[PDB]
Write a protein that binds this ligand. Structure first.
Ligand SMILES: CO[C@H]1CCN(Cc2c(C)cc(C)c3[nH]ccc23)[C@H](CO)C1
Length: 285
């Protein structure tokens, strides 16, 4: 497929966006986002589901449609466990916070429903107009160089999408961005912050080099996207933030230099993506 290409407003501009609603909602468990990655699969965050009967715990829609898609199986990353660091006084642990929604029915791609490119695929090689000798490490050097990286995510409200520009701190601001996990309630006592911020995470947010918009809980599972030569490449999955600016803008205005968002780096979950998606004709390297 020609991934990460516009085929207009809202889903005409971001046709890989998926909207997830929690069926039995509660405070902190209302909504998520995801990304169409193939005709049968939506990529999202594991923490969007109930661990029991995952398949009946959400509805998912694409293309800004009213209709819900039939969910056949939900596949959690096997390393994911929100309770895995409770003994270290870490109440919620978001390492490997990624899940695949396997749809019963094949999606029909159109103007409002298209797949996004994934890292280390032939789709991304072609989208970035790279040669057939291209390796996964070269794609990583192209997409996540050691610098502040221009990127974007999308928030949804009543079928309307808002694209937000953010910068991934992957250069000399990386350590500062990661250490700011201590501003997140519940992570403020851990002595070694690399216990919460593992190598699975990319870090956005803050006011340098630009005033990054922050994520909210309902953005969980949405794609973190790099825009290159009119193509959109997913590099991350929104996992967790220091401050939910939908609920607590007050707190972000108190600590704006430290208001970071954390995303699962898809380059760090490739063996799982490659295995689960091996029959989807995406041509993993
Ligand atoms: C361990 O708890 C800390 C991390 C998770 N935070 C909530 C949260 C989740 C779950 C997911 C996304 C995308 C969020 N975006 C902004 C906030 C936020 C809480 C409260 O900020 C503090």
């Amino acid at each position: 497929s020609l991934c990460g290409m516009v085929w207009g407003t809202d889903y005409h501009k971001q046709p890989w966006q998926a909207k997830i609603s929690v069926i039995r909602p509660s405070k902190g468990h209302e909504s998520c986002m995801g990304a169409v990655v193939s005709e049968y699969f939506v990529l999202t965050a594991a923490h969007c589901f109930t661990v029991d009967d995952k398949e009946h715990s959400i509805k998912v829609s694409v293309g800004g449609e009213k209709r819900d898609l039939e969910i056949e199986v939900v596949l959690f990353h096997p390393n994911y466990n929100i309770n895995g660091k409770k003994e270290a006084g870490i109440p919620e642990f978001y390492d490997y916070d990624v899940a695949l929604i396997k749809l019963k029915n094949k999606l029909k791609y159109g103007q409002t429903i298209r797949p996004i490119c994934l890292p280390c695929t032939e789709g991304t090689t072609r989208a970035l107009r790279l040669p057939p000798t291209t390796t996964c490490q070269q794609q990583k050097e192209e997409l996540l160089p050691a610098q502040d990286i221009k990127a974007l995510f999308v928030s949804e409200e009543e079928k309307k999408l808002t694209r937000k520009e953010v910068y991934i701190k992957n250069g000399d601001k990386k350590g500062s961005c990661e250490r700011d996990a201590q501003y997140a309630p519940g992570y403020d006592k851990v002595k070694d912050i690399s216990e919460v911020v593992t190598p699975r995470f990319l870090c956005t947010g803050g006011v340098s080099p630009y005033a990054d918009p922050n994520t909210c809980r309902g953005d969980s599972g949405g794609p973190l996207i790099v825009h290159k030569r009119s193509r959109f490449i997913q590099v991350g999955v929104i996992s967790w933030g220091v401050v939910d600016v939908c609920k607590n803008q007050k707190r972000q205005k108190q600590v704006p230099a430290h208001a970071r968002d954390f995303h699962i780096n898809l380059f760090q979950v490739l063996p799982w993506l490659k295995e689960k998606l091996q029959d989807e004709d995406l041509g993993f390297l």
